[PDB]
Design a protein around this ligand. Sequence first.
Ligand code: BCL
Ligand code: BCL
Ligand code: BCL
Ligand SMILES: CC[C@H]1c2cc3[nH]c4c(c3C)C(=O)[C@H](C(=O)OC)c4c3nc(cc4[nH]c(cc(n2)[C@@H]1C)c(C(C)=O)c4C)[C@@H](C)[C@@H]3CCC(=O)OC/C=C(\C)CCC[C@H](C)CCC[C@H](C)CCCC(C)C
Ligand SMILES: CC[C@H]1c2cc3[nH]c4c(c3C)C(=O)[C@H](C(=O)OC)c4c3nc(cc4[nH]c(cc(n2)[C@@H]1C)c(C(C)=O)c4C)[C@@H](C)[C@@H]3CCC(=O)OC/C=C(\C)CCC[C@H](C)CCC[C@H](C)CCCC(C)C
Ligand SMILES: CCCCCCCCCCCC[N+](C)(C)[O-]
Ligand SMILES: CCCCCCCCCCCC[N+](C)(C)[O-]
Ligand SMILES: CCCCCCCCCCCC[N+](C)(C)[O-]
Ligand SMILES: CCCCCCCCCCCC[N+](C)(C)[O-]
Ligand SMILES: CCCCCCCCCCCC[N+](C)(C)[O-]
Ligand SMILES: [Fe+3]
Lengths: 241, 281, 302
Amino acid sequence: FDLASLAIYSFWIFLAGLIYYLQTENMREGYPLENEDGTPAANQGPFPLPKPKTFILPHGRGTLTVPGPESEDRPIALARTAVSEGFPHAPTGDPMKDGVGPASWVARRDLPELDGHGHNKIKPMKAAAGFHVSAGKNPIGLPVRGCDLEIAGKVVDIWVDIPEQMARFLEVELKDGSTRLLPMQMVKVQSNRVHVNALSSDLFAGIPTIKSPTEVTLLEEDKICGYVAGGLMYAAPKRKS
Amino acid sequence: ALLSFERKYRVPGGTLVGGNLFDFWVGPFYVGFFGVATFFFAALGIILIAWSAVLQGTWNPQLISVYPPALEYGLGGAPLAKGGLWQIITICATGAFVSWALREVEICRKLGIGYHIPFAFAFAILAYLTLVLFRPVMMGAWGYAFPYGIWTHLDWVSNTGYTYGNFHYNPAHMIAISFFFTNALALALHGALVLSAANPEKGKEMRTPDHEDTFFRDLVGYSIGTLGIHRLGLLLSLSAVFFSALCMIITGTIWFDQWVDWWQWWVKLPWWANIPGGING
Amino acid sequence: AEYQNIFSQVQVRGPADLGMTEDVNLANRSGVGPFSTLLGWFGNAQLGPIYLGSLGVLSLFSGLMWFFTIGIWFWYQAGWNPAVFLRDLFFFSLEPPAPEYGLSFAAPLKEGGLWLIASFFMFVAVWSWWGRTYLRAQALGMGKHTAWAFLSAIWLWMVLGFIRPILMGSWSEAVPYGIFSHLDWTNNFSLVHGNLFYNPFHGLSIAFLYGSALLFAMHGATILAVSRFGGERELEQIADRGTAAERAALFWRWTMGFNATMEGIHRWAIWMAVLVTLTGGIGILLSGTVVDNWYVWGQNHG
Ligand code: BCL
Ligand code: BCL
Ligand code: BCL
Ligand SMILES: CC[C@H]1c2cc3[nH]c4c(c3C)C(=O)[C@H](C(=O)OC)c4c3nc(cc4[nH]c(cc(n2)[C@@H]1C)c(C(C)=O)c4C)[C@@H](C)[C@@H]3CCC(=O)OC/C=C(\C)CCC[C@H](C)CCC[C@H](C)CCCC(C)C
Ligand SMILES: CC[C@H]1c2cc3[nH]c4c(c3C)C(=O)[C@H](C(=O)OC)c4c3nc(cc4[nH]c(cc(n2)[C@@H]1C)c(C(C)=O)c4C)[C@@H](C)[C@@H]3CCC(=O)OC/C=C(\C)CCC[C@H](C)CCC[C@H](C)CCCC(C)C
Ligand SMILES: CCCCCCCCCCCC[N+](C)(C)[O-]
Ligand SMILES: CCCCCCCCCCCC[N+](C)(C)[O-]
Ligand SMILES: CCCCCCCCCCCC[N+](C)(C)[O-]
Ligand SMILES: CCCCCCCCCCCC[N+](C)(C)[O-]
Ligand SMILES: CCCCCCCCCCCC[N+](C)(C)[O-]
Ligand SMILES: [Fe+3]
């Protein structure tokens, strides 16, 4: 009829095409859908998989094409608890060591994240020229306490993001002279101590170690962060008040 | 069916009520005790809206409207046909929203993540409760609440505003709008920035966060950084809703005259109140 | 309680970052500014450097001329008295020419002439700022997404101040420069066009403005919740999916039945926001050119 009705009807058609485009772009990871045993599910939904795109990664690190063949590339220590679809899967060993549930990690590349100039993004502050604590309480030297109110160690360095100028891990020394990394997002700095709610003192030695003392890889960060977040569920027995 | 990477996360535990009784999924959806509660409250709410429609005499969704009790009932119960249904549906709606938040908390526990999402959602719930519970109680009648209907609720917005003149002149409403407009600006910039680094000029390598900071310093002399922009969006969005609730809790209670007239406090300060000229002298 | 990651517990600082080079002309970057400890609790502490070439100088110069054009008019309405100036600040107004003059530039300074001068200066300030968002992206080899999204905001401003007045045949249909006066104009526009709640484009615009707040609350809260697995590092999570991105997707899949990717949530984001000013500009353009009364229109067209 009139030009305003032509406009509103055109707009609704545009919006339907836009939602279609947006949903298919959000299917570039994780699909096709699967059954509980890893085979392809029968009903994938009404939206098809998008045609593949390729990212060119910087610093000679190659390309990525998605969607592409999906696999976990690691063992999963879990078993069914019911004879039909839709129930939980129980750990078959120790879920902190096996890396399942809230303790899960992914098999990212075993190289460190690089910066704009091709140098390691995260370094210990001792090896990062001109870096220093500019505000707040400096943690280096403080004892570290677990959720059982017992001392697990002391802080010996901060690991910093150089490009973004941010504290990312604390490096902690244990009773036997070895060290581990703790994510800054899972600690609480106080006047006289660092406190860690997610872990009890006896679980600190099981934190995954890094293979070189002056860098961390993407695979290593995932294993470390997955393991400390997992203690919220699996350490709870020793947590207290 | 599951996403290719999902099975390792579907473990037992994290529930707040019921132990393992309701610890299961239907397709993609997690259930839990609070999944059962939201279904019960939602279904009962929908049935009562239907019953309201028979008594009105339409099934047209553009005309169905459920009205609160008229002012003469004050804060008591009303008959179903004349406001009682609105009172019961409001109880169901509140029960559904709170249940939906607590179900989100169980999901957080199973996945080992922070509680920031249900915390943010609780601000929306608050804004709803200000309009249908807190303001009406402080004013002395359920009748000051809004009706449930597609067009009739806009009518309420229009009549409520024009009761105090041009509502633009509410100062808390001015601040709330600034936050809404600023939040939409920031959301456009964040999405554009990340996409412009993941999708560079044809044939070039993906950019780095260093390119993202550089872009913004070249442009406005400052970059807030990748952690900072997510903190910022959370804050602008919640502040917008906080000042919206505040701008209505004061209207009809501490202030009930025309909002334009409030600004006379500024112009009547004795220093300049009598100097001639300008607009107000 | 758990740490929440809204403010940082410790700040760390190194040498000033001069930034990436790529094809940028370095002769046009300033020096670095000072560091702010205050800002550093919430984001980055470094101020500067800034780029400033021919197009930035132009934008700034005309931007200030627009400001001072408005400012001297306000002073003159205040009779040059600084007490009156602060007292009546929100009430002063620079108004467009009267209907009498139509689209001509022949009106006197005191009665529309200054409004035209101020609008000239605003027009060059904004369009040159737009050019600079395009060029700064190109010098670094990045996509043009920021310039395309800014264009959607420019559309609504262009319709309000230039395109709709041209099509109606007079400058008197445009918006005055004033704090309270531009609110009165907004209220009056709705009254005269039969209540803007019946404009379907106005309703859509509101859906996207509410939805932008919904979506940034969802997205911001989600990334803070997975920051304990390095979730804010969004670009590398695109290139090599980690447990941060998997847990973020499953929260939403388990809650509402579907989910995004780390790249894909940013496409939802840019579109939700851009559609606010896109639908809004259309709704205003049609008002008074094609439809005089939205109530009346709604009665005849479902
Ligand atoms: C003529 C009318 C007056 C006026 C009168 C009013 C009145 C009256 C009010 C506002 C309010 C607001 N106005 Mg005003 N306003 C006017 C002009 C404007 C203009 C403008 C450009 O001119 C703007 C930008 C605004 C902006 C705003 C916002 C600040 C605020 C609304 C957001 C809000 O509260 O969200 C809060 C969000 C919610 C309440 C949503 C809650 C969602 C709940 C929790 C869950 C829903 C679940 C749902 C049922 C799920 C279904 C699921 C499906 C099955 C899938 N007004 C004019 C001058 N304005 C309102 C306000 O501040 O309210 C507190 C208000 O009451
Ligand atoms: C916030 C201040 C005012 C108000 C002012 C306005 C104004 C002004 C406008 C709207 C508009 C809308 N309002 Mg209202 N609105 C209010 C309170 C609410 C509440 C509530 C329970 O608190 C609800 C559910 C709604 C719902 C709606 C939608 C019908 C419509 C688009 C909103 C949107 O996209 O948001 C953002 C959310 C999303 C994009 C997510 C999707 C949400 C979907 C679309 C909600 C559908 C609800 C469904 C129809 C009702 C439930 C049905 C069953 C019983 C479950 N409003 C308060 C009283 N609202 C616009 C309109 O077009 O009205 C006709 C409009 O112009
Ligand atoms: C009584 C008044 C009427 C009414 C009259 C109008 C009118 C008239 C309009 C709106 C418009 C809008 N209204 Mg309405 N509106 C009413 C009731 C409401 C209610 C409500 C709850 O009741 C709500 C939520 C809204 C919401 C909205 C928005 C969705 C929309 C504005 C989008 C935007 O981001 O603009 C803000 C963005 C811009 C203005 C773009 C700016 C771009 C430029 C380039 C920036 C230059 C910056 C400069 C150089 C720097 C200077 C610095 C400064 C000094 C700070 N209205 C009532 C019914 N509303 C607008 C619209 O789209 O309508 C369809 C519009 O024109
Ligand atoms: C605080 C900032 C903003 C915000 C945030 C926010 N909203 C959220 C969340 C967050 C963080 C969620 O996690 C949650 C979610 O799951 O999103 C997908 C949600 C959510 N925000 C929603 C909507 C919504 N949010 C809005 C606003 C906002 N949400 C703010 C602007 C608005 C409006 C009007 O602006 C709406 C419409 C839902 C999509 C979802 C919550 C879903 C939910 O509670 O489901 C349980 C209930 C039901 C399934 C149905 C109940 C049926 C009732 C019993 C009967 C209906 C009665 C109703 C009152 C009638 C209304 C009639 C109208 C015409 C007036
Ligand atoms: C998608 C729709 C939303 C949107 C998007 C959007 N806006 C944008 C962009 C985008 C994508 C940009 O890229 C662009 C930008 O650069 O953002 C950083 C912009 C922008 N949006 C802006 C504002 C803005 N956007 C708004 C709205 C919106 N923008 C929508 C909600 C609004 C309103 C009314 O709601 C406003 C007010 C600007 C910040 C910026 C565009 C800048 C511009 O055009 O500037 C012209 C230049 C001037 C006016 C120069 C004068 C300014 C100062 C007076 C200079 C100060 C220096 C002086 C020398 C002082 C010296 C002091 C010393 C002694 C210390
Ligand atoms: C306005 C946004 C709401 C519309 C979005 C619709 C998306 C439904 C997508 C179904 C997802 C497919 N699935 C579950 C099989 O993976
Ligand atoms: C939007 C925030 C505004 C920040 C503006 C800061 C600009 C910094 C300019 C660099 C300082 C130049 N200096 C002082 C070294 O000569
Ligand atoms: C022709 C209209 C163009 C849109 C301008 C809208 C008015 C801007 C309101 C701010 C007025 C200027 N000032 C000095 C108070 O900032
Ligand atoms: C990109 C996200 C899409 C979200 C879709 C939101 C739909 C809102 C429906 C509101 C109806 C508006 N109406 C009837 C006035 O035209
Ligand atoms: C207008 C808002 C309506 C939004 C409905 C979106 C819900 C999508 C859930 C679909 C996933 C469930 N299932 C069984 C198809 O997989
Ligand atoms: Fe993001």
